[PDB]
Write a protein that binds this DNA or RNA. Structure first.
Ligand SMILES: Nc1ccn([C@H]2C[C@H](O)[C@@H](COP(=O)(O)NP(=O)(O)OP(=O)(O)O)O2)c(=O)n1
Ligand SMILES: [Mn+2]
Ligand SMILES: [Mn+2]
Ligand code: NA
Ligand code: NA
Length: 323
DNA sequence: CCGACGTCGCATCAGC
DNA sequence: GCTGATGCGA
DNA sequence: GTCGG
């Protein structure tokens, strides 16, 4: 419908982030691309698009050029640019951001092939990102996500039956596919007022049954790694997937569950309705805003519905949280 | 005009 | 060796 | 790049 415009803006967004290192221009282009993608008409002019929140003068100008020529001169130019295109591409490797990609291209390292010839110049994360470059860019069918959930909940309960684990993200919202697996973990012995090994014992077990295959980062509260479903007999093996496991205190668990379930826009909207009701919501707590704007102590939470009631909101199932 | 634009855990770097 | 900054992907 | 105080 407006795919040409949105693809154009998305591509401009990446070059800003990865090449120009302008994170705010990156978000600006993506916000404009998002608001246009939801627009239910084929855009006839830049002036028409400028009415949308996130589309200003510059983008309205760029849209006019695209509509009249079928392309953007600047975008066509940076596409052909060997240095810029290589920098932007290298950032597709997990662990290689704008800064690392810049350094690599500066010293002649421009392709995955070049990265493969230069392992010693890559850190642990970047090696894993390189190894699973293809797998990481694939999506995960819900059926596989269900099998992944089966393993996680089973092994977690096996370590300690008092653990509470919840797979959040787009999966919990009931999406037909997901980009990764977000696991939230808590235990009755862990509160805010509070063992340093609650997360480790879970990771260890998942590694023992060969579910977790690699580790990108691991601390006392947050694990980021790689997992893979078991090979079904003599059939083709499953792609490696990204998995995060977060250990959250019991009293902050459901604010965490609410947040990490999403979606992006839903959180933004829910934070807005909360503020107009005199409440502030982060990933940890929900707090009442005093008469002068001072935030008081965090209110007790025992479920998602508690937060919904606090701001006088009708509870919405994760299924209906796309926005 | 000009500052905000989310904030943070972990790995690793820079400086001392 | 320690501390704070930076990069990175959330 | 866009918005808004
Ligand atoms: N911009 C962001 C990023 C993260 N989040 C918190 C809520 C997002 O819905 C959520 C989970 O992040 P995510 O996995 O990167 N995105 P999401 O699960 O919606 O998409 P997939 O990666 O599962 O395809 O974390 C947020 O509210 N806003
Ligand atoms: Mn996710
Ligand atoms: Mn995620
Ligand atoms: Na990257
Ligand atoms: Na990337």
């Amino acid at each position: 419908l407006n795919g040409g415009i949105t693809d154009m803006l998305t591509e401009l967004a990446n070059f800003e982030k990865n090449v120009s290192q302008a994170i705010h221009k990156y978000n600006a282009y993506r916000k404009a691309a998002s608001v246009i993608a939801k627009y239910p008409h084929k855009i006839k002019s830049g002036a028409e698009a400028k009415k949308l929140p996130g589309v200003g003068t510059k983008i309205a100008e760029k849209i006019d050029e695209f509509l009249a020529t079928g392309k953007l001169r600047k975008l066509e130019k940076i596409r052909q640019d060997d240095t810029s295109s290589s920098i932007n591409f290298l950032t597709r490797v997990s662990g290689i951001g704008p800064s690392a990609a810049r350094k690599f291209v500066d010293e002649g390292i421009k392709t995955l092939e070049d990265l493969r010839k230069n392992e010693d110049k890559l850190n642990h994360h970047q090696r894993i990102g390189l190894k699973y470059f293809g797998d990481f860019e694939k999506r995960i069918p819900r059926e596989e996500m269900l099998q992944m959930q089966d393993i996680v909940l089973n092994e977690v309960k096996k370590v300690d039956s008092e653990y509470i684990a919840t797979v959040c993200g787009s999966f919990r919202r009931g999406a037909e596919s997901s980009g990764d697996m977000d696991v939230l973990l808590t235990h009755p012995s862990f509160t805010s007022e509070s063992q340093p090994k609650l997360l480790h014992q879970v990771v260890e077990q998942l590694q023992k049954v060969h579910f977790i295959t690699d580790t990108l980062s691991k601390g006392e509260t947050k694990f980021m790694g790689v997992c893979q479903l078991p090979s079904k007999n003599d059939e083709k093996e499953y792609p490696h997937r990204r998995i995060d496991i977060r250990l959250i205190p019991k009293d902050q668990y459901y604010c965490g569950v609410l947040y990490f379930t999403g979606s992006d826009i839903f959180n933004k909207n829910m934070r807005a309705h909360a503020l107009e009701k005199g409440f502030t919501i982060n990933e940890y707590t929900i707090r009442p805003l005093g008469v002068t704007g001072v935030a008081g102590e965090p209110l007790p939470v025992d479920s998602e519905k508690d937060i919904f009631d606090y701001i006088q909101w009708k509870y919405r199932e994760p299924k209906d949280r796309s926005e």
